[PDB]
């Protein structure tokens, strides 16, 4: 058998509360919103959060890339609630923060989150029109994650008791030293350090921060577009994703001991999986596009499923398939895999 409890997972990211509601076309027009696009909240969207809560159907689900990864991972290991994922981030002790913390803990995540007063809790207006979602994100409190919180006994212990470390690329936009504290911690606990490249702009605008974390990164996870901009960052003039993966194994600095893994998802095409033993492609199940609700956090759901599989000690291929299952399940919205 396996008879295995999952490894304690540490997740750090920018926590946002999805303020989610079906809205009229008039609502999008009112707020200058182009349908199906994700943008950061500007002066043009002033009042949207107060206005989306007028909708009788409005829902509040805890969100943000890394927090959704943590939620999906916990949703797979439901027998281990409070005993599996710890999430670190920065909220505010406002009403958006309470719902976020309280709805994430209830699902089984230990929320070792900071409470700042310098900004309100991070939130995302999820504007639904049929099966189309228009996103308006306000980073807020999430960006104010402090060295003080990372020193705090709660986070240090959370890290000390963890064996798997997942960081979204967005953590590098805040403060690299927070990430580098966990990088050192993964060395100490002999744990495993995983990044998600999260977005192309990370490799373009925050390349210095990424480069300081790469030697410590055991598993690099990205999609085709994130993978390609990585090659652009590295000066690898190629659009062959598998080639990029193999060079990310041996041509990107790695001082770790567990071994460098590179996972590149390719939406409709097979997931590239690379190690020091060569490149391998894991085909993604064929899907009907008239059954896709939205590709929102499909990469987050892949990463959530991939984690829960690694935490129970499944092999790398098995983890990619567990990622596929969860990704496509969340695409079409207890486990059955
Ligand atoms: C163009 C304009 C601004 C820019 O800076 C950014 C810097 C950071 C972010 C960002 C987004 C983000 N999240 C948090 C997790 O959910 C997904 C979105 N965390 N950090 C977004 C934009 C990059 C490119």
Residue numbers in the entry: 0 to 332, 340 to 343
Give the original sentences from the paper that presented this experimental model.
However, the diffraction from one of the apo crystals that had been soaked with compound 1, while still exhibiting several overlapping lattices indicative of non-merohedral twinning, was of sufficient quality to allow indexing of a single lattice, yielding data of sufficient quality for model refinement to at resolution of 2.8 Å. The crystal system was found to be tetragonal with space group P41212 with one molecule in the asymmetric unit and without any contacts other than typical crystal contacts with neighboring molecules in the crystal lattice. TbrAK in complex with compound 1 adopts an open conformation, and the location of compound 1 was unambiguously identified by its well-defined electron density localized in part in the adenosine binding site in the adenine moiety binding area, but pointing away from the ribose binding region towards the solvent. Moreover, only this orientation satisfies a number of hydrogen bonds to the protein, supporting the conclusion that compound 1 binds to TbrAK with the phenoxyphenyl moiety pointing towards the outside and the morpholine being buried in the active site. Compound 1 forms three hydrogen bonds with the protein, namely with the side chain NH2 groups of N13 and N142 (water-mediated) and the main chain nitrogen of S64. The phenoxy moiety of compound 1 interacts mainly via hydrophobic contacts formed by F169, F200, F204 and F205. Thus compound 1 is able to induce the formation of the anion hole also in absence of ATP, which could favor ATP rather than adenosine binding in the ATP binding pocket due to favorable interactions with the β and γ phosphate groups. As a result, the intrinsic substrate inhibition would be abolished, which corresponds exactly to the recent observation of abolishment of substrate inhibition conferred by compound 1 towards TbrAK. As compound 1 is not strongly interacting with the lid domain, it is most probably not able to interfere with the hinge bending motion to close the lid domain.
